[PDB]
Amino acid sequence: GHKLAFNFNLEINGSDTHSTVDVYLDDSQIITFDGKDIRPTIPFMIGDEIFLPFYKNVFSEFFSLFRRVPTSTPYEDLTYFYECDYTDNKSTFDQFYLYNGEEYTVKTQEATNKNMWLTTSEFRLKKWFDGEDCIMHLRSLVRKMEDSKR
Numbered sequence: 001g002h003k004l005a006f007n008f009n010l011e012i013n014g015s016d017t018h019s020t021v022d023v024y025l026d027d028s029q030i031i032t033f034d035g036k037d038i039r040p041t042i043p044f045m046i047g048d049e050i051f052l053p054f055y056k057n058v059f060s061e062f063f064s065l066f067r068r069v070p071t072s073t074p075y076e077d078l079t080y081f082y083e084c085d086y087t088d089n090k091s092t093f094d095q096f097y098l099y100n101g102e103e104y105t106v107k108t109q110e111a112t113n114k115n116m117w118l119t120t121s122e123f124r125l126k127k128w129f130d131g132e133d134c135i136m137h138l139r140s141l142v143r144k145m146e147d148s149k150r
Helices: 051-064 113-126 131-147
Strands: 002-013 016-025 028-033 038-040 075-087 090-099
Touching: 002 051, 002 113, 002 131, 016 051, 016 131, 028 051, 038 051, 051 113, 075 113, 075 131, 090 113, 090 131
Parallel strands: none
Antiparallel strands: 002 016, 002 075, 016 028, 028 038, 075 090
16 A cells, blocks of 8 residues: 655744645655755655646645734644555545644634634645545656656
């Protein structure tokens, strides 16, 4: 089986934001994004002109459209994990949310970054990158790695 996982992290320091995305293919990091630049972290992805600019746009859209309020605490770390899996000709998916490292699932009746993050993250990502896209990318990436001169 194979997995393509995306780890979205938004760090809120006062009013400034630092965003990161790490992409893992079968538990190997292949792509990293630091808010401004996207980069390959594995040889077969070096020189890629198809996935890198695509993800760069997706990741930028994901973070820039998040409607945040001013933080009460000096630091807030918001995590959104998304993974698709293709095993035995079967497509499965998994996602979760972390606030300062801690998983949470329940939406509350107050206007906080923690709540907005939980409420909008999946919907926001799926606008440019849904499960079907993830599976296609996954299978395409697996083949690309196998066919690569590395």
